[PDB]
Nucleic acid binder design. Structure first.
Ligand SMILES: [K+]
Ligand SMILES: [K+]
Ligand SMILES: [K+]
Ligand SMILES: [K+]
Ligand SMILES: [K+]
Ligand SMILES: [K+]
Ligand SMILES: [K+]
Ligand SMILES: [K+]
Ligand SMILES: [K+]
Ligand SMILES: [K+]
Ligand SMILES: [K+]
Ligand SMILES: [K+]
Ligand SMILES: [Mg+2]
Ligand SMILES: [Mg+2]
Ligand SMILES: [Mg+2]
Ligand SMILES: [Mg+2]
Ligand SMILES: [Mg+2]
Ligand SMILES: [Mg+2]
Ligand SMILES: [Mg+2]
Ligand SMILES: [Mg+2]
Ligand SMILES: [Mg+2]
Ligand SMILES: [Mg+2]
Ligand SMILES: [Mg+2]
Ligand SMILES: [Mg+2]
Ligand SMILES: [Mg+2]
Ligand SMILES: [Mg+2]
Ligand SMILES: [Mg+2]
Ligand SMILES: [Mg+2]
Ligand SMILES: [Mg+2]
Ligand SMILES: [Mg+2]
Ligand SMILES: [Mg+2]
Ligand SMILES: [Mg+2]
Ligand SMILES: [Mg+2]
Ligand SMILES: [Mg+2]
Ligand SMILES: [Mg+2]
Ligand SMILES: [Mg+2]
Ligand SMILES: [Mg+2]
Ligand SMILES: [Mg+2]
Ligand SMILES: [Mg+2]
Ligand SMILES: [Mg+2]
Ligand SMILES: [Mg+2]
Ligand SMILES: [Mg+2]
Ligand SMILES: [Mg+2]
Ligand SMILES: [Mg+2]
Ligand SMILES: [Mg+2]
Ligand SMILES: [Mg+2]
Ligand SMILES: [Mg+2]
Ligand SMILES: [Mg+2]
Lengths: 101, 88, 73, 119
RNA sequence: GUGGGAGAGGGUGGUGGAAUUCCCGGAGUAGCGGUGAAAUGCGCAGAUACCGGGAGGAACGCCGAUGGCGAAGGCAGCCACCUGGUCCACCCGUGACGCUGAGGCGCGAAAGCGUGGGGAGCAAACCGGAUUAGAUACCCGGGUAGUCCACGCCCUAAACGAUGCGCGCUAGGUCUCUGGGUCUCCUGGGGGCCGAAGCUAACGCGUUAAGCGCGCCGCCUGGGGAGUACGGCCGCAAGGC
């Protein structure tokens, strides 16, 4: 067990319904592997710095889950299967390194 | 890797007495743990030569200690080998 | 000579490890989406190092740019 | 004939020639010129003068389509790169803004033996 | 042992953006390219310049350092997993268990070799254009092996600090990376510069010694012939010792 951060950027053109199905599959997978959502920050959509998948925006998802290391790579590989899932960035959580504080 | 508990387990399982952390036996045990864990790693990544340098060093560090033990208490020696299941 | 104000001084407390605060990270990139030098970021080697890491993360997410077009001239 | 009145002016400078391509607001070329498009044939094409003419030539060819103002995009570091700018400014066409956008890799292909060394 | 730390140390998988090339579409027209000057070359079967889409390979801009890591070779996008070394604090445990290391074994840049794959860019050879007294060259247009991946070989080098490893001892100053502390500064590990004593043929070295000492290994003994011949060992070969 280790604490990670599953970042996910989704298709900025999903209707309240579409957003939901994809967003659940995310929930579905997280379980099948051994994740445990401690918190989420559906920041929603923002203007990308460069066009990703031909769009100037992306719908952002965040999670401070905890799971079994030997699966992190496998799970991430899974989330990516979806076509509305255009980004999967998983990161080992870290102690905030302040500065100029 | 090797977690505190795992580590702590073997230590206890080998301390010559409560509190014994750095005895020849404890060391050889601990070393054997690493050597083995590492040995398995190499069976997989046969190309990780650098790590293999380390393996080589431990195997040697172990020989050194065991050699010492066997010259000081040939008994605890046979005992430790038996437990750890070393030698040939 | 790398004059003017340093990016660190011109700012408050922040988490150099937070690869999502575009508002603050965005400050360490030049006019072009390039990562600013210590001379300019006013950071310590150790800090500067951590920055580069998070910035690179922000870029891959799309939050920050990899490069921008030079304006004026 | 097509009337555009506003578009882009791409200046492709290099140490061997200057070459201006004027396009619509979508990048589609309307007209273009270069050191060779004018008299110059040898090394006189990389001359800043060549640039000037070549640039001016394009500006006129553009005026014809009603072109009145344009955004400049500069690529390359040849001589007369700054001359093509200067030229366009004094070309009737209103220069809305300059912008250098020379491509640079983040290190992809081994350069020709002629372009090798760093630090 | 316990608690902390920095790192391009290694291996595996995945992944991101820039650029080159090719292909598709648009728009567009007479050149582009290249040089000291040119020409070969490419372009009206429409190139160059410009915009949009796609495929593919290789390398990672800024950060970036005078920086860091590694025993050496060497190591640089980002993420995860597997894994080596190492520094510091606490003085907790063993109780000289240490140092060196012929032979052996392993690692070992590039080029090269085998089998299979890949192949964008670059490019021995080679095909051409120039230059020249000539030009089996430098400059220019092309281009095969190769450069990349897997597995197995090869074992070399200005494999360099041209400085074997370990330990103790002998002023300081200054910049720096990384850690601890009562945090001007003190203390430890690493990276530089200048310098006490001393050393050195000199240049220079100078707590990162080339100083003062002890331990162990390797090596030298004028130049050419020659890293050749012979023999042995190794390698598929090239060839290595
Ligand atoms: K021609
Ligand atoms: K360095
Ligand atoms: K480690
Ligand atoms: K071949
Ligand atoms: K290689
Ligand atoms: K080999
Ligand atoms: K400190
Ligand atoms: K002297
Ligand atoms: K000198
Ligand atoms: K022989
Ligand atoms: K043979
Ligand atoms: K050989
Ligand atoms: Mg020319
Ligand atoms: Mg520790
Ligand atoms: Mg590394
Ligand atoms: Mg591309
Ligand atoms: Mg076309
Ligand atoms: Mg022709
Ligand atoms: Mg025709
Ligand atoms: Mg054709
Ligand atoms: Mg082209
Ligand atoms: Mg294109
Ligand atoms: Mg291809
Ligand atoms: Mg070193
Ligand atoms: Mg480790
Ligand atoms: Mg004690
Ligand atoms: Mg005692
Ligand atoms: Mg030894
Ligand atoms: Mg080799
Ligand atoms: Mg090679
Ligand atoms: Mg081969
Ligand atoms: Mg082949
Ligand atoms: Mg070529
Ligand atoms: Mg001739
Ligand atoms: Mg050539
Ligand atoms: Mg050297
Ligand atoms: Mg010093
Ligand atoms: Mg020091
Ligand atoms: Mg220091
Ligand atoms: Mg250094
Ligand atoms: Mg003196
Ligand atoms: Mg000195
Ligand atoms: Mg000494
Ligand atoms: Mg010899
Ligand atoms: Mg002789
Ligand atoms: Mg003689
Ligand atoms: Mg000789
Ligand atoms: Mg030889």
């Amino acid at each position: 067990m280790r604490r990670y951060e599953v970042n996910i950027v989704l298709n900025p053109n999903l209707d309240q319904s579409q957003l939901a199905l994809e967003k659940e599959i995310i929930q579905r997978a997280l379980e099948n592997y051994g994740a445990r959502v401690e918190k989420v920050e559906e920041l929603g959509l923002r203007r990308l710095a460069y066009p990703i998948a031909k769009d100037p925006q992306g719908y952002f998802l965040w999670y401070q889950v905890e799971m079994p290391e030997d699966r992190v790579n496998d799970l991430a590989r899974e989330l990516r299967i979806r076509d509305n899932v255009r980004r999967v960035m998983v990161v080992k959580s870290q102690e905030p390194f302040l500065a100029n504080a | 890797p090797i977690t505190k508990e795992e580590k702590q387990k073997v230590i206890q399982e080998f301390a010559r007495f409560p509190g014994d952390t750095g005895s020849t036996e404890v060391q050889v045990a601990l070393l054997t743990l690493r050597i083995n864990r590492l040995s398995e790693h190499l069976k997989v990544h046969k190309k990780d030569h650098h790590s293999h340098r380390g393996l080589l060093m431990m195997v040697g560090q172990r020989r050194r200690l065991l050699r010492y033990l066997q010259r000081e208490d040939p008994e605890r020696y046979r005992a430790l080998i038996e437990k750890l299941g070393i030698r040939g | 000579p790398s004059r003017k104000a340093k990016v660190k001084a011109t700012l408050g407390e922040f988490d150099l490890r937070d690869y999502r605060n575009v508002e603050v990270l965005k400050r360490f990139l030049s006019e072009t989406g390039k990562i600013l030098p210590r001379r300019r970021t006013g950071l310590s080697a150790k800090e500067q190092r951590i920055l580069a890491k998070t910035i690179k993360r922000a870029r891959i997410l799309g939050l920050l740019p990899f490069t921008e077009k030079l304006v004026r001239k | 004939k097509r009337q555009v009145a506003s578009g882009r002016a791409y200046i492709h400078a290099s140490y061997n020639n200057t070459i201006v391509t004027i396009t619509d607001p979508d990048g589609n070329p309307i007209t273009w010129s270069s050191g060779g498009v004018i008299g110059y044939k040898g090394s006189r094409k990389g001359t800043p003068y060549a640039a000037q003419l070549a640039a001016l030539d394009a500006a006129k060819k553009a005026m014809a389509y009603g072109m009145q103002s344009v955004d400049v995009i500069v690529r390359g570091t040849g001589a007369g790169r700054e001359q093509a700018i200067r030229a366009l400014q004094a070309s009737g066409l209103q220069v809305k803004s300059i912008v250098d956008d020379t491509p640079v890799p983040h290190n992809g292909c081994r350069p020709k033996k002629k372009f090798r060394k760093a630090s």
